[PDB]
Amino acid sequence: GAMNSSNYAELFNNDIKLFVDDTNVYRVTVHKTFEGNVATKAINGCIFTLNPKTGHLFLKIIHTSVWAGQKRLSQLAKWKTAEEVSALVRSLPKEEQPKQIIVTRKAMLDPLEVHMLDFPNIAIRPTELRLPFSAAMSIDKLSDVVMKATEPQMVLFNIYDDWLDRISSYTAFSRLTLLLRALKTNEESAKMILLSDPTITIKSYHLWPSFTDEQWITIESQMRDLILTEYGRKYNV
Amino acid sequence: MNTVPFTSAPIEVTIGIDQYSFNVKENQPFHGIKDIPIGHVHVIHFQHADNSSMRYGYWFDCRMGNFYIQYDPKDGLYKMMEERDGAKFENIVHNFKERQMMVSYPKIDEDDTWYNLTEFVQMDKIRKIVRKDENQFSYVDSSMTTVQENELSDPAHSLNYTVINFKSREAIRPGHEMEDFLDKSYYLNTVMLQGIFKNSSNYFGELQFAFLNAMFFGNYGSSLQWHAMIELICSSATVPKHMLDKLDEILYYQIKTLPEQYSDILLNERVWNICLYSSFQKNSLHNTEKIMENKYPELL
Numbered sequence A: 001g002a003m004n005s006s007n008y009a010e011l012f013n014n015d016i017k018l019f020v021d022d023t024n025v026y027r028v029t030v031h032k033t034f035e036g037n038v039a040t041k042a043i044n045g046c047i048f049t050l051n052p053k054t055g056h057l058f059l060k061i062i063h064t065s066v067w068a069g070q071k072r073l074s075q076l077a078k079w080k081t082a083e084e085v086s087a088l089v090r091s092l093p094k095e096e097q098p099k100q101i102i103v104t105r106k107a108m109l110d111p112l113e114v115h116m117l118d119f120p121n122i123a124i125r126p127t128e129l130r131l132p133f134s135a136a137m138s139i140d141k142l143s144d145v146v147m148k149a150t151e152p153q154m155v156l157f158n159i160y161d162d163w164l165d166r167i168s169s170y171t172a173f174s175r176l177t178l179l180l181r182a183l184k185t186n187e188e189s190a191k192m193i194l195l196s197d198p199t200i201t202i203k204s205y206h207l208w209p210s211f212t213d214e215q216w217i218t219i220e221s222q223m224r225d226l227i228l229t230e231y232g233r234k235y236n237v
Numbered sequence B: 001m002n003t004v005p006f007t008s009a010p011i012e013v014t015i016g017i018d019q020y021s022f023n024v025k026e027n028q029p030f031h032g033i034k035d036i037p038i039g040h041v042h043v044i045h046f047q048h049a050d051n052s053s054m055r056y057g058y059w060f061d062c063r064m065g066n067f068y069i070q071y072d073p074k075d076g077l078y079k080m081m082e083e084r085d086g087a088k089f090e091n092i093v094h095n096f097k098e099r100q101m102m103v104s105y106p107k108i109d110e111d112d113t114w115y116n117l118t119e120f121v122q123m124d125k126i127r128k129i130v131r132k133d134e135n136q137f138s139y140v141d142s143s144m145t146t147v148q149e150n151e152l153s154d155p156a157h158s159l160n161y162t163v164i165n166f167k168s169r170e171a172i173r174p175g176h177e178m179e180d181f182l183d184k185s186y187y188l189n190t191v192m193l194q195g196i197f198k199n200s201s202n203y204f205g206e207l208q209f210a211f212l213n214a215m216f217f218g219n220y221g222s223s224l225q226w227h228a229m230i231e232l233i234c235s236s237a238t239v240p241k242h243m244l245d246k247l248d249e250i251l252y253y254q255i256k257t258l259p260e261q262y263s264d265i266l267l268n269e270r271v272w273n274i275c276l277y278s279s280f281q282k283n284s285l286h287n288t289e290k291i292m293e294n295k296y297p298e299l300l
């Protein structure tokens, strides 16, 4: 059924699974027209499809041309997401196909179930977890490839860099969600925490800085402080 | 006018004939029902006074044979049987009619209710939903499950309604996923009407039979089927106009006949609110919307 805190360890077992987040598929800026009306202008988007055990991220870039001449774009975006996820599954060898796909938003359930009717053994599940994957576009290298795209494109990343050489998947996912939650809550402060030290850099082939184990402990504490600080600011606590 | 004679009434029972019903006491001198209108299917149904469990009954058409009811004390129910000896049957009916031991089918002249509820219902189609080929009449009861219910367990005792499943490969063309899911016209017109039912009259016949089994027996799977067949039409943007107008009539008389006190168990809020207020056909069912709003405003 639904994925929650009670069955959280399931994320890191040996059954292949993918999270799908569609929050950045259809992106717009809202502006005034010359006549004083309001209009939207779409910008490039992306599907965030993530294997939480391995860190493999299938980033399908949604180019704005896919919306041209289409109506009800917020509805269409869910079905386009489901179409692209189904196409990805079919593109994978059988032994790499997921046994479960967990959607971060319940409105994705029916579009994905319908697109996956040919795969009756792949469970489509919601989750009760509030996952911060909308903040993926706060990761500079992901945002850059999305905004530079001139056509539909799939780009593959490992969202954990090389962390699994030193930590478990459970700890890696915990770090990722903390970092993403911090970037979502206060993007400027989170980026300052991550980059303030000139001596620590991001490898060309990585998304995050090359922190030692002890430095990651400091960073994680600073991210938790940021989240708590923002909570106090928001609620006057 | 035809008759269903009864050998006797050895157990106290509420007897239904179509939309009518009456109580028979234990060992009362009751010998059957006369003046049954020729030209329609009928249903004769039963609910025992000492055990309201299992409503059950028989769909029949008097043009297809001479049928009578006799209590079986081993199986504990009133059974329908066919008499092949026509002279014997005429003699038995005349004796009962002479002794005034029969109730008269109590149809008012102005009253087209039963025709309106069974307009498209045919005995030959009932016998394909209810499979018992050795009899010309069909037994149904409160507890019989449908083929679809049995996929999600005795196959010989099932209601073989046409399976409708909005999230099935049958309902969704590859490459038309969004289109076919949000607009069920393909599934309605090509798969169901052209493909399976052949025409709208057969579709409406099954819809009407499903409603009647839900209402007279409290058969839950029949109610599911009735609502699915409504929702399939309402959720289709392209429906022939004659079908929409006929569906409005069909549903109006169904809602009109439903007992007010059974509405909580016979009507699905989601389906009805969706059909009347959100669906493609929200403005095509004028008579049904008017009776629903005046009779069951709480459901909505």
Ligand SMILES: COC(=O)CN(C)C(=O)c1ccsc1
Binding pocket: B004, B005, B006, B007, B032, B068, B069, B083, B089, B092
């Ligand atoms: C209603 O039609 C019936 O045939 C009922 N029945 C069998 C009798 O009344 C009967 C026949 C032979 S001795 C009693």
